[PDB]
Amino acid sequence: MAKWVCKICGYIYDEDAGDPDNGISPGTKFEELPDDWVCPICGAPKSEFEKLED
Ligand SMILES: [Co+2]
């Protein structure tokens, strides 16, 4: 699946890994993350992520 980078801290949201420590199962698309999910490292909102693709 796709990977997204936090433009603040460099955390990679890997859709294949999800974010289970914060309620997100592996395989959850970025678009499907709750609106108020934040970067688990720096706390940045979803707005600050960019998808890693051309
Ligand atoms: Co971050």
Side-chain angles (χ1 to χ4, degrees), residues 5-12 38-44 48-49:
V5 65
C6 178
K7 292 174 311 164
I8 307 291
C9 73
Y11 170 79
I12 304 293
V38 296
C39 176
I41 305 307
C42 74
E48 304 309 281
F49 282 74

Side-chain angles (χ1 to χ4, degrees), residues 10-53:
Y11 170 79
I12 304 293
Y13 179 72
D14 180 355
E15 293 176 346
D16 286 318
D19 183 16
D21 290 357
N22 298 286
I24 306 298
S25 57
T28 300
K29 294 204 191 296
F30 187 81
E31 284 80 10
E32 300 163 345
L33 297 168
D35 287 348
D36 62 340
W37 180 95
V38 296
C39 176
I41 305 307
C42 74
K46 286 183 74 188
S47 65
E48 304 309 281
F49 282 74
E50 286 189 351
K51 192 177 192 168
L52 295 181
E53 64 179 20

